[PDB]
């Protein structure tokens, strides 16, 4: 705080302000198609000969 | 500072006077600034070519 001889008026002190930030999200769309070509052949845990 | 006085004499302690400075009701506006010479109490001040507070003196070049 400023030093002032006790006759004179005084000193005035400045101040500060604000800031802002904004954001927007991004959009994600993965997918799969399923044929009969993917369903039919053998999933690995299945016995030989007859599925 | 050491020995006391045993003699007889008189002396004064001082003489106060007031110092009245204001005489009216205008606003009283101040700012502090940097000086550039020796300045007494309640001396009228000017400003030299650089902005320093030189005490007032007419008849100057």
TrEMBL record, chain A:
Subcellular location: Virion; Host cytoplasm
Source domain of life: Viruses
Extent of the signal sequence: none
Family membership: Belongs to the lambda phage major capsid protein family.
Protein role: Assembles to form an icosahedral capsid. The assembly is primed by the interaction between capsid assembly protease and portal dodecamer, and major capsid proteins assemble cooperatively to form the procapsid with the help of capsid scaffolding protein. Major capsid protein forms hexons and pentons of the icosahedron. Viral genomic DNA is packaged into the procapsid through the portal vertex. The packaging triggers a dramatic reconfiguration of the capsid shell.
Assembly and binders: Homomultimer.
Protein name: Major capsid protein
Annotated source species: Salmonella phage YSD1
Biological classification of the source: Viruses, Duplodnaviria, Heunggongvirae, Uroviricota, Caudoviricetes
Gene of this entry: YSD1_17
Span covered, complete protein: 52 to 102 of 354
TrEMBL record, chain B:
Lineage top rank: taxon: Viruses
Name used for this protein in its record: Putative+head+decorative+protein
Lineage per the UniProt record: Viruses, Duplodnaviria, Heunggongvirae, Uroviricota, Caudoviricetes
């Amino acid at each position: 705080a400023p030093f002032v001889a006790p006759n004179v008026q005084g000193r005035v002190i400045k101040e500060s302000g604000y800031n802002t930030k904004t954001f927007k999200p991004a959009y994600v769309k993965p997918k799969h198609v399923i044929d009969p070509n993917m369903i039919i052949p053998r999933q690995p845990g299945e016995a030989l000969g007859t599925g | 500072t050491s020995l006391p006085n045993y003699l007889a004499g008189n002396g004064d302690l001082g003489s106060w006077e007031p110092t009245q400075i204001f005489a009216g009701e205008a606003d009283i506006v101040t700012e502090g600034g940097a000086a550039g010479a020796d300045i007494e109490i309640y001396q009228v001040i000017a400003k030299n070519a650089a902005g320093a507070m030189v005490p007032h003196d007419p008849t100057a070049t």
